[model samples]
Target chain A: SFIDRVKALLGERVKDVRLTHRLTDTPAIVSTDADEMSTQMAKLFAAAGQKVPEVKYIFELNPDHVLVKRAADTEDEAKFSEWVELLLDQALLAERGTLEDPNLFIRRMNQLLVS
Target chain B: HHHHHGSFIDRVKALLGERVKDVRLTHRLTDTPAIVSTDADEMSTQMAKLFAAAGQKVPEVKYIFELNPDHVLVKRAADTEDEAKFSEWVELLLDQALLAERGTLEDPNLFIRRMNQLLVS
Candidate 1:
C-alpha cells in the first residue's frame, strides 16, 4: 500500500520502488539496479570532466517502521502522501549528497508543517 | 606555482592561485578597482545563495576577477612594493568583489579587521 502511495508521488524518478523488512532505525533507502552506475562513480567521472548521464533507482522502505504505521492510520491520503514525499526526499538526500534545488524541499516541509 | 612579475593583474592572479580563472582589464565597473565574477557556465549568484542556505557545499566556482586598470586605486596598487599593505589591499579587493556580487560576506569580522589594519597603516 505504501509502495503504491510513494510510487504515485515520485513516479518514474524511482523504478522498482518496493518495501523491505530488512531495515532498522532508517525509514527508507535507495539502491541502484544491478550493473547500474554508482553515484560515487558518477561524481568521480563528472569531476574528471566526463558526463556519466543520470539514472534513477529502487526505493526500499522499512515496512514495519513507525512512519509506515502513521501512513496507514492517517485518514488523509493527500496529507499522508506529503509525509511520504518528505521521507523519500530525506532518504534521497542522505544517499545522493546533493539535490539540484534543496529549497524546493524546504518549501514543501514548511507548507506541510503549517497546513 | 611560479611567481610572475608580469603585471598587477598577473601577480594577483598568481597569489590567488587557481581560485580565480582569469584577471582581465574591464570597462564595466566604476569606482571599483576589481570585481569578481564566476564562469558563465558555473552556478549563478542567486542559486549559490540557495545552496548556502540549505547548508550544501556550493562549488568553489572560481571567479573571473576583472580589474579597472584606469582606476587610481589600481595604479597605486601596481606601483606599490609594500608587501604588508599590498596584501591587505588585495584581500580587501577580493572581499569587496564577493560583497559586490552576493551582497554579503562569509566573514565580516575578517573584512573589518583588514580594513582597520589598512587604515591604521
Candidate 2:
C-alpha cells in the first residue's frame, strides 16, 4: 500500500516504486531499470555537455527501516507524501551527490525540520 | 495519496486572489515547489519567443499556477498564521518555480532580497 501510495504521488517522476529486501539500514534507495540506460552512462553524457532525456529512477523502499515504518503509520496522506519526497530526495542526493535544485532541497529540509 | 482539491486550494486562491488565473494541487511535481503554465489554449512561452523572433507582437500569456500539495513548503505556507509572511513565502515559491522552469526571473533583485530576509528570519 505504501508503494502504491508512493507511485501515485510520484507519478511519472519514477519508473517504479516497490519494496526491496536488499536494504538493511537505509529507508530507501534509487535504482535503474534493467533495460534502461544506466546512471553512469547518463553522467558521461552530461559530462560531455550533451543534453539527455530525464532519467526515470526506480524507487526502492525498505519496510523494516524505522523511518519507513514511521511513514507507514502516518495518518495524514499529505504528510506521508512529504516524507516520501524527503526519502526520495535523500536517496537521490546520496546516489548523485548533488541535486538539480539544491536550494529547494535545503529549504524543504529546513521546513520539515522546523515544522 | 489524498487529492487536496478542497480547502487548501481555497486558502491559496484567497491569498493569491487575482494574481494568477487559478491554483490547483498537482501530482506531477515531485521536488519542485510550484509551476506556472499557460492555459491549454493559450500561447506558450516557446511559441511566444518564436513570434517575437518573427517580428510579431503577442499579448502576455496568463498562467495557471500548480502547487505540489505534498511539499512541506506548501503545507507550511498554507497554514502560516501571519498573512504578510505567508504572502512573502507564496511569492518566493512562485518565483522559485518560475526560475526553475524559465531559467530567469522578472525581478531577481526582489527575489534575492526576499530570500535573504527569509533566511535571516
Candidate 3:
C-alpha cells in the first residue's frame, strides 16, 4: 500500500528508486539466500533515516518436493523415519540457519523418535 | 415476506446495513476449458462486470488472468473426472492458501490426516 502511495507521488520519475517495488515477504537481508536484495534495500532506506530491507520472496510450493516425498514415501519405515528427522533438521536450518549447539541436531532427532 | 425482509441469519451477519443482508458466490476457482490466450479482452470485461455487480457500484476488479506456459496442473484438470470434487478441492486449496497467507495455518495433524482422507475419499 505504501509502495502504491510512493509510486503515485513520484509517477514517471519513479525509476530504479529501489523502494518502488512490491514485497511479499519480510526483509530479505535477514535471509542468507537473498541477502543482496535486502542489503540494497536497507542501504536505500538508510538514506531516509529508516533502516529496513526490501524483499521479494522466492516461490514456495506447498506440494511435496523430493525432500518431502523421500520423507513421505519410504518402504523402510525406520530408515524413512530417520529421513524425516533429517528433513526436519534441514527445515529448521532453512528457517533460521544458525543453531546454538550443532551436536544437538542429531541428539534432538534421536530424542524426538524415542519420545 | 421472506424474500423482502432480512432473515434472522442476515441480522446476525449484517452489521453495516440492509445491503449486507444477502450473500452470494463471493469466491470460487473455475476449471473450465476457457482459452487463456484466446478471448483475452472478453475475460477482462467479464471480470470487470463481476466486480461491478458487487460492493457499492465500484468498477469491477481489474484482475487479469495470466496463463502459464507449463501449467501442467491446469491442463490435467481440464480432462479430469469428478469435476465437482475437483471444484471442492479448488475452494479448499484457495481457502487454505488464504489461511496460510494470514499466518494462521495452525493445524498440526492436518497434513497426515488430509492425505489419508484424500486417499480414501
lDDT per model, in order? 0.66, 0.73, 0.33
Q: Which pairs clash (backbone N, Cα, C closer than 3 Å) in model 2?
A: none
**Model 1: per-residue lDDT, tens digit, B11-93?**
77777778777888775535556677766668878777788889898675667888767655555567779876666777767
lDDT of 3 at A69: 41
Please list the residue runs of candidate 3 whose C-alpha ends up more than 4 Å from where it truly belongs after superposition.
A1-73, A76-115, B1-69, B105-115, B119-121
Put down candidate 2 lDDT per residue, B3-114, tens digits, no spaces.
5644767777888787778888786535666778887778877888799889998876556889877777777788887889888888878776666555555665565456
lDDT (tens digit, per residue) of candidate 2 on A4-91? 8788989999999889887565677898887787787788898788986578899998897767787788889888877787778767
Pairs with backbone N, CA or C atoms under 3 Å apart (clashes), candidate 3: none
Q: Considering summed lDDT, which 10 consecutive residues are worst modelled in model 1 chain A?
A: A106-115
> 1 or 2: which has the higher DockQ?
2
For candidate 1, lDDT tens digit of each residue in A8-87?
87788877788888856566677787788777777788878898667677888777766656665666878777667766
Q: Write down the TM-score of every candidate.
A: 0.45, 0.50, 0.23
For model 2 chain B, the run of ten residues with the poorest summed lDDT:
B111-120
TM-score of model 2's chain A = 0.90
Residue B73's lDDT in candidate 2 = 74
Model 3 clashes, total count: 0
